[PDB]
């Protein structure tokens, strides 16, 4: 019993942005992977490292799930560390990290935001919710937009039939964290 | 017809060796 | 002797603006290169290739002077072979021309506008008036100001008692050109 | 206070590729 929400947090309406995610910890519960492992058609799957066929057996201290609506072909960027504008600015997964990502296209379901380049490369696992002015030029722009003054974030709102490769994708990342002295959170019996 | 190139578990509908996967169910999975 | 007129164009009451700078063509006449230099105290007479002799020996087919206004720390870009949209996006001179640049202060004398992002750089010697809204993002602003959509023009403030760097003074660029149909020239006294 | 590379005489009060050094009667130029 006491199944994790899983489906609810995955079938959730009004999905969040991409530059500003919402890391949700999943607390002590018994989580069957059948609904995630097997689904309605489409709904691609891309799981690295450790595989469910033995996660059904072993136990994990705790897990985090993050959700976002990244569009385009850059869904390849969520993979072992690859240099690409999405990766180093809309956060990069660490190489040693062995969680799994599941993506599928969203057109029937769907004004949205997309993070622009930062002043420097960014380490994994920190949010960059931030509205300031990017200082490209040596001349301190220190205010409203001008030469080398770019306000981050972009949009693609209301884009029906923009191209089969351009359709709105959405993807979710799961990370299994094993802190010292495990407590709970096992597989189904 | 999906199929998994990584030596095991073919997949049926109605590249590169990184690790264990199950991908390319849609048309996004490949690059060429 | 219909002396070639310079007092009216330097001592003009309404000096116009850098956004819409009044190009003034001067017809055939005889100049007095004595008032040109040693003008009112303090001024700039930067030029490239000007010895007074070859000015006074003979005069040329025609001349198209230009006049405009900027603050203190931007007189670098009016000189040719320079970048910086502070003046590049409003003016630009070729590397081959041989005119002069004249500067004089107007703090005592004194709403004015400022050029801002333009779709692309302009060659030497065009004209651009544009109330049409500029865009730097993907969403078409197509109307009033919005995300990434800004008013294409900006003011100068002309605030008195501002800093020595942050005060305006005006500039006239003088171009001497000899063109085709040589049988017009110009005659010394 | 200002040395002219062209060798012509500067004007007495009471860095780029330029030709005439009958200039710099003001504090606009120089570092």
Numbering used by the authors:
A (entry chain D), C (entry chain B): 333 to 442, 450 to 528
B (entry chain C): 49 to 62, 100 to 117
D (entry chain A): 49 to 62, 100 to 116
Authors' description from the paper:
The Cryo‐EM structure of the complex between the S protein (BA.2 variant) and IBT‐CoV144 was determined to investigate the neutralization mechanism of this nanobody. Due to the inherent instability of VHHs and RBDs, a mask was created using the density of the RBD‐VHH dimeric region. Subsequently, local refinement was performed to get a density map with a resolution of 4.05 Å. The binding of the VHH to the Class 4 epitope was demonstrated, with each VHH binding to a single epitope of the RBD. The main amino acids involved in the interaction were found within the F374‐T385 loop of the RBD. The amino acids F377, C379, V382, S383, P412, and Y508 on the RBD can interact with IBT‐CoV144 by forming hydrogen bonds. To investigate the static potential of RBD and VHH, separate calculations were conducted. The results showed that the VHH at the interface of the interaction carried a negative charge, whereas the RBD had a positive charge. As a result of electrostatic interactions, the two proteins formed a complex. In addition, the interface area between two RBDs in the RBD‐VHH dimeric portion (456.8 Å2) was smaller than that in the RBD‐6M6 dimeric portion (562.7 Å2), which affected the stability of the RBD‐VHH region.
